Design a protein around this ligand. Sequence first.
Ligand SMILES: *[C@@H]1O[C@H](CO)[C@@H](O)[C@H](O)[C@H]1NC(C)=O
Ligand SMILES: *[C@@H]1O[C@H](CO)[C@@H](O)[C@H](O)[C@H]1NC(C)=O
Ligand SMILES: *[C@@H]1O[C@H](CO)[C@@H](O)[C@H](O)[C@H]1NC(C)=O
Ligand SMILES: *[C@@H]1O[C@H](CO)[C@@H](O)[C@H](O)[C@H]1NC(C)=O
Ligand SMILES: *[C@@H]1O[C@H](CO)[C@@H](O)[C@H](O)[C@H]1NC(C)=O
Ligand SMILES: *[C@@H]1O[C@H](CO)[C@@H](O)[C@H](O)[C@H]1NC(C)=O
Ligand SMILES: *[C@@H]1O[C@H](CO)[C@@H](O)[C@H](O)[C@H]1NC(C)=O
Ligand SMILES: *[C@@H]1O[C@H](CO)[C@@H](O)[C@H](O)[C@H]1NC(C)=O
Ligand SMILES: *[C@@H]1O[C@H](CO)[C@@H](O)[C@H](O)[C@H]1NC(C)=O
Ligand SMILES: *[C@@H]1O[C@H](CO)[C@@H](O)[C@H](O)[C@H]1NC(C)=O
Ligand SMILES: *[C@@H]1O[C@H](CO)[C@@H](O)[C@H](O)[C@H]1NC(C)=O
Ligand SMILES: *[C@@H]1O[C@H](CO)[C@@H](O)[C@H](O)[C@H]1NC(C)=O
Lengths: 135, 135, 135
Amino acid sequence: SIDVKYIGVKSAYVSYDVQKRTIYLNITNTLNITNNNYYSVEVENITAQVQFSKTVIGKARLNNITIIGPLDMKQIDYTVPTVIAEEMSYMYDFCTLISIKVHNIVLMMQVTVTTTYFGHSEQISQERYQYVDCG
Amino acid sequence: SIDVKYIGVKSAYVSYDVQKRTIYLNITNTLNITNNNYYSVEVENITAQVQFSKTVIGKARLNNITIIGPLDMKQIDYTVPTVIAEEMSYMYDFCTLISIKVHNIVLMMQVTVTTTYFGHSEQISQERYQYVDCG
Amino acid sequence: SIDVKYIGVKSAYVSYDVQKRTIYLNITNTLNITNNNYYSVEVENITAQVQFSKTVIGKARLNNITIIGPLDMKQIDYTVPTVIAEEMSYMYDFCTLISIKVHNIVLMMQVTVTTTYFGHSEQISQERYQYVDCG
Ligand SMILES: *[C@@H]1O[C@H](CO)[C@@H](O)[C@H](O)[C@H]1NC(C)=O
Ligand SMILES: *[C@@H]1O[C@H](CO)[C@@H](O)[C@H](O)[C@H]1NC(C)=O
Ligand SMILES: *[C@@H]1O[C@H](CO)[C@@H](O)[C@H](O)[C@H]1NC(C)=O
Ligand SMILES: *[C@@H]1O[C@H](CO)[C@@H](O)[C@H](O)[C@H]1NC(C)=O
Ligand SMILES: *[C@@H]1O[C@H](CO)[C@@H](O)[C@H](O)[C@H]1NC(C)=O
Ligand SMILES: *[C@@H]1O[C@H](CO)[C@@H](O)[C@H](O)[C@H]1NC(C)=O
Ligand SMILES: *[C@@H]1O[C@H](CO)[C@@H](O)[C@H](O)[C@H]1NC(C)=O
Ligand SMILES: *[C@@H]1O[C@H](CO)[C@@H](O)[C@H](O)[C@H]1NC(C)=O
Ligand SMILES: *[C@@H]1O[C@H](CO)[C@@H](O)[C@H](O)[C@H]1NC(C)=O
Ligand SMILES: *[C@@H]1O[C@H](CO)[C@@H](O)[C@H](O)[C@H]1NC(C)=O
Ligand SMILES: *[C@@H]1O[C@H](CO)[C@@H](O)[C@H](O)[C@H]1NC(C)=O
Ligand SMILES: *[C@@H]1O[C@H](CO)[C@@H](O)[C@H](O)[C@H]1NC(C)=O
């Protein structure tokens, strides 16, 4: 993961952020640039060789080699009564982003209950922009 | 994952963000650029060789080699009564993004209960923009 | 996943964002650019060799080699009574994006209960734009 970037307003290799009142003139700004990037990553050469009970040559009664489980998860239990029992909102809004009593859930799961798993996984997750940009 | 980017308003390799009042003139701005990018990633050369109980040559009674389970997940249980028992909203809004009592859920799952899985998975997830841009 | 991008308003390789009052003139802006990109990714050369119980040569009574399960998921259980028992909304709106009591669900699943799975999966998920752009 080479560039996990979080630039705030903006990114740029070569920028001229000139943004208030600036009489500027007769500039030469010669720019030779050689920005080579090389990426030679994640060269897996693996030989797992994953094996159960290779050679029971004779008479070996085997039993219960791999008991995974039993198991529960029960991950998300809000259990939120919220018995206000007198609501008088009287809610005057102006140009406000306003989230009320919302349940934003992003449950991303992968590679669950898999005996074996080679190679690789990847879970990216962007989040909301939500730009009012009011007057 | 080379560029997991989150640029805020904007990205640009070579930008001129000139955005207030700026008399500018007679500039040469020569730009030689060689931006080569090379990506040579994820070269898997794997030999899993995944095997159960290769050679029971003789008389081996085998039993219960791999008991996965039993199991439950029960992931999302809101259980949200919300018995207000007197609602007088009286809700005057102006140019407000307003989420009320919404349940945003994005349940992304993959590769579940798979004995074996080679290669790779990938779960991207963008989120909402929601740009009011009011007056 | 090389560019998982989230540019906020806009992206551009070579931009001139000139957006307020700017008398600008006699500029040469020569731009030699060589933006070669090479992508040589995900070259899988795998030999899984996935095998159960290769050679029971003699007399081996086998049994219950792979018991996956039993199992439940029961993922999404809102269970949201919401017995307000006096609603007087009186809801005057102006040019507001307004979500009320909506249940946005995006359940993306794939590769479930598959004994084996080679190659690769991919789950992208965009989200809503929802641009009011009111007066
Ligand atoms: C910019 O260049 C011209 C030409 O060489 C020169 O006459 C002028 O004086 C320069 N600008 C200023 C503000 O002096
Ligand atoms: C520009 O940079 C490249 C790379 O280093 C070089 O080969 C070339 O001679 C340079 N040219 C000038 C005019 O500086
Ligand atoms: C991968 O490993 C094998 C086993 O030793 C070897 O013969 C081969 O040269 C290796 N290749 C690379 C690119 O590492
Ligand atoms: C193997 O595991 C199961 C799981 O509970 C159990 O019921 C059984 O008795 C075990 N076998 C032996 C021989 O103990
Ligand atoms: C821009 O260039 C012209 C021509 O060389 C020059 O006469 C002028 O003075 C320059 N600009 C300014 C503000 O001086
Ligand atoms: C521009 O850059 C390239 C790459 O380094 C180089 O071969 C070339 O000579 C350069 N030209 C000038 C005029 O600088
Ligand atoms: C992959 O591995 C095999 C086994 O050793 C080897 O012969 C081959 O050269 C390797 N290739 C690469 C590109 O690593
Ligand atoms: C194998 O596992 C099952 C799962 O509960 C169990 O009922 C059974 O008794 C096990 N076998 C032995 C021989 O214990
Ligand atoms: C732009 O170029 C002309 C021609 O060279 C020059 O006369 C003029 O003065 C320049 N602009 C300004 C504002 O000086
Ligand atoms: C432009 O760039 C290319 C690539 O580096 C180079 O071959 C060429 O000579 C350059 N030309 C000029 C006029 O700079
Ligand atoms: C793939 O692996 C085989 C087995 O060793 C090997 O002969 C072959 O050269 C490899 N090819 C590449 C492109 O890695
Ligand atoms: C094999 O598993 C099943 C699943 O419950 C079980 O009923 C059975 O008794 C098992 N066999 C043995 C020999 O234990």
